[PDB]
Design an enzyme around this catalytic site. Structure first.
Site, short mmCIF file in Angstrom:
data_model
loop_
_atom_site.label_atom_id
_atom_site.label_comp_id
_atom_site.label_asym_id
_atom_site.label_seq_id
_atom_site.Cartn_x
_atom_site.Cartn_y
_atom_site.Cartn_z
CE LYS B 10 36.64 -41.98 -10.58
NZ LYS B 10 35.43 -41.63 -9.87
CE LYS B 15 40.36 -34.29 -3.58
NZ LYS B 15 39.28 -33.72 -4.37
CE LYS B 41 30.53 -27.83 -8.49
NZ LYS B 41 29.77 -26.67 -8.04
CG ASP B 129 39.07 -37.08 -11.94
OD1 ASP B 129 38.44 -36.04 -11.73
OD2 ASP B 129 38.66 -38.17 -11.54
#
Ligand code: SF4
Lengths: 289, 289
Positions: B10, B15, B41, B129
């Site tokens: 997530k 991360k 991104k 996600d």
């Protein structure tokens, strides 16, 4: 004149809570509203139905074999204010596209005619953590013409808002899909009220409401209900009423103007969430500088 | 024996910071490592290359017209420890699938032969996600056999981790794809060290490391560099070395056992992040109870 709407925004900033409280205030206006939940977890309707988790079209198509083997009684529920409630369901993890849960769901509601039935508003609760064609389904299939984006004074939320906007742009010149405004869900960051109006302008819309972070929203929430339902006489209840006012009364629907990353960091540095850079220390050890 | 690995997890729990610090400690072990960034991104390589944002295959296929018009010099960079660095790039917002940016990128690296060249490790930085087939590309096309999931003691991180696991399950019985463990990225929540070992067991793996939240990670980060690079003599540097140890030395690769939502709330209620429910107040106004 039944209006088709979607609430897009980043996860974990309490989008759904605001979606549901907004919708509850509209039922108090005497508007029949249907929420179509589009998230893999079933969190888009649980404050309206007092539910741990509403059953989803995906889980129940799995029970019945296919979708035609399902009837609207248990797919579409209604709770506080005769607010209709569907939950699309998530893709089989690691294999399906999210988008096909949402077409499967809209197609199932067009066919068993829940759309042309008595309704004033449809609201699709959609995730903005990734702005792919998966999550852009209600945009691309011209099912939501009024998109209101929830964000906050923080990078990723604003990034999300801009990317949702880029998507409204691609599909705007072949349909009625427009951005009706932004909504700041306060994270008690200093002067984010201002920051989101600044962003709303450089994009070409408005910040249609500032939603503060009250304590009662959390206390209504542990009871699986809205603030409009728990304590109508709170400050916060009025906050949602006022937002729901503005949404009916709104006619500022636009085709936005996305900004750049540089422009986005401007906005974050200017209002002080982002720290003003020093490249005179970039790439230097603890010891060097 | 070049091993193919992926770091799933997530967003917003740092991360990528732990992916990059882990990889930096492996270059210090004298391992040639390549990070393939898979997020929209370009945040998967910027600590290794001291970059604001590494250029991505998508942006540069856009420059050149197609992918063949690109050469490895500017697609693949190298920084601290001759750590190779590609960034896949995001889908055109609201229209493409994310997955096709990642196949376009692995295909481009197979063809210009960066894989069979001298390398010890490949590491795909993948978002968790949404666990759709888009983000499961390196699993489905058997490009990552060792999956280590980053999480924390919080609902959505754990939810993500379980869902990634359900994905490993579908693709396990047709390939070498296995879960090699979990990694708790501490959010300073009380007894999350414990919580993630509890989860790692009910899933059938281990919590291969607990990464604490130091202050130096943030101070290295504003300099666009790892803690291994900024201050090798910090506590935190040793933390990443120890993790990178365990990863080489690990042979506990499994086919996990996903739990339910109910079981997940168990774990959260037991260790005290989740509040023990009272349905004796669910659905009741401020006034009633
Ligand atoms: S389009 Fe988006 S939701 Fe669909 S499979 Fe791809 S990344 Fe996933």
């Amino acid at each position: 004149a039944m209006r088709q709407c979607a609430i897009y925004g980043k996860g974990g900033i309490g989008k759904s809570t605001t979606t549901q409280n907004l919708v509850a205030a509209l039922a108090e206006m005497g508007k029949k509203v249907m929420i179509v939940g589009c998230n893999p977890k079933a969190d888009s309707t649980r404050l309206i139905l007092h539910s741990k988790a509403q059953n989803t079209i995906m889980e129940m198509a799995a029970e019945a074999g296919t979708v035609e083997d399902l009837e609207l009684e248990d797919v579409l529920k209604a709770g506080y204010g005769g607010v209709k409630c569907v939950e699309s369901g998530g893709p089989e993890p690691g294999v399906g596209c999210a988008g096909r849960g949402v077409i499967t769901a809209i197609n199932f509601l067009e066919e068993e005619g829940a759309y042309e039935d008595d309704l004033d508003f449809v609201f699709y609760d959609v995730l903005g953590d990734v702005v792919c064609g998966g999550f852009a389904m209600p945009i691309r299939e011209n099912k939501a013409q009024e998109i209101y984006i929830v964000c906050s004074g923080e990078m990723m939320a604003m990034y999300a808002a801009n990317n949702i906007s880029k998507g409204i742009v691609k599909y705007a010149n072949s349909g009625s899909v427009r951005l009706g405004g932004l909504i700041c869900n306060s994270r008690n960051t200093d002067r984010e009220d201002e920051l989101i109006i600044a962003l709303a302008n450089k994009l070409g819309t408005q910040m249609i409401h500032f939603v503060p972070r009250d304590n009662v929203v959390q206390r209504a929430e542990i009871r699986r209900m809205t603030v409009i339902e728990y304590d109508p006489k709170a400050k916060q209840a009025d906050e949602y009423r006022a937002l729901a006012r503005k949404v009916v009364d709104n006619k500022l629907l636009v085709i936005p103007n996305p900004i750049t990353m540089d422009e986005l960091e401007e906005l974050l540095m200017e209002f002080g969430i982002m720290e003003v850079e020093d490249e005179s220390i970039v790439g230097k050890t603890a010891e060097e500088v």
